[PDB]
Design a protein around this ligand. Structure first.
Ligand SMILES: Cn1cc(-c2ccncc2)c(C(=O)N[C@@H]2CCN(c3ccc(Cl)cn3)C2)n1
Ligand SMILES: [Mg+2]
Ligand SMILES: [Zn+2]
Length: 313
């Protein structure tokens, strides 16, 4: 009950900002997660012992990949923490619980390869789950860990509440399949512009939560430029590895995954900003006005990639 988590002064103040970087000290990240749960959810939300064990079993189930790793998980959960803290009254006790856990679990057991590559490889997972292949696997790994002895962090919920939170988690993890993002954001754009967006409508809440998941997943593009630039190295380290595995299947990869084409990266980034990132944060800011600092930072990074292209860096 009375056993609070306390960060050092700099992290105490900066953890509240959208552009917070969790740091290189891996042993501090569990603690930073529990801190976020306690302030976002309460000190009564989860049994500490159950939560600690759960977190450690989650960490162990992320692989040693350049980008889709334990650090990405914690980084996505922080961006959701920042959203939820800036939007106190909008979300239910169940949603706050579920969404931090969904963010921590969203890339469980990622091998660093796209849905596309699994399907072209003919991976077993592409037979078990024909769409959102990796995301259905992430949800299936999340249920696994929740079902280890001592790892049921939701044990104090009723049967029906437990079913709702696992449905919040299922939808939130599926929503991280970027292929689903474009149509979701368009639906949200019309609903907002025609003033029919209704947050008591559950089908509507699910779409807004979907877009929050995309926002949190892409939050690399919302950091300060030195963080954004160095994070791009880890992302393209996985893209080029996949490119290499495509070329082993006898398939020319897209330029995004071809290391021979590292020259076209700065133009590649502008398209991403213009086609995904800026639209994602713009729509998020219309629906949830206090998430504007995400759109501001993303625009700052677009300007930096236009300077790279101009050779101002
Ligand atoms: C799934 N996802 C996440 C990210 C992400 C996230 C955070 N920082 C950066 C990229 C991207 C992403 O950058 N992808 C675009 C899509 C096209 N692309 C090209 C295209 C041609 C060349 Cl030569 C180089 N990159 C970059 N895609
Ligand atoms: Mg993913
Ligand atoms: Zn992710």
């Amino acid at each position: 009950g009375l056993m609070q988590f306390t960060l050092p002064v700099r992290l105490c103040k900066e953890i509240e900002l959208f552009h917070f970087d969790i740091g290189p000290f891996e042993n501090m990240w569990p603690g930073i997660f529990v801190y976020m749960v306690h302030r976002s959810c309460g000190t009564s939300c989860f049994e500490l012992e159950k939560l600690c064990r759960f977190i450690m079993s989650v960490k162990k189930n992320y692989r040693r990949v350049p980008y889709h790793n334990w650090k990405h998980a914690v980084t996505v959960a922080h961006c959701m923490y920042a959203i939820l803290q800036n939007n106190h009254t909008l979300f239910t006790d169940l949603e706050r619980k579920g969404l931090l856990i969904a963010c921590l679990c969203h890339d469980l057991d990622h091998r660093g390869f796209s849905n596309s590559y699994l399907q072209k490889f003919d991976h077993p997972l592409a037979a078990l789950y024909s769409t959102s292949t990796m995301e259905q696997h992430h949800f299936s790994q999340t249920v696994s860990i929740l079902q280890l002895e001592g790892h049921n962090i939701f044990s104090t919920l009723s049967s029906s509440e437990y079913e709702q939170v696992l449905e919040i988690i299922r939808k939130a993890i599926i929503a991280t399949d970027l292929a689903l993002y474009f149509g979701n954001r368009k639906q949200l754009e019309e609903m907002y512009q025609t003033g029919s967006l209704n947050l008591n409508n559950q089908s509507h809440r699910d779409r807004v939560i979907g877009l929050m998941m995309t926002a949190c997943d892409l939050c690399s593009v919302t950091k300060l430029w030195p963080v954004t630039k160095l994070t791009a190295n880890d992302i393209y380290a996985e893209f080029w590895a996949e490119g290499d595995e495509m070329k082993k299947l006898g398939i020319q990869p897209i330029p995004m995954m071809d290391r021979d084409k590292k020259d076209e990266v700065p133009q590649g980034q502008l398209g991403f900003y213009n086609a995904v990132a800026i639209p994602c944060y713009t729509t998020l800011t219309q629906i949830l006005p206090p998430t504007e600092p995400l759109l501001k930072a993303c625009r700052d990074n677009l300007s930096q990639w236009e300077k790279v292209i101009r050779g101002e860096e």
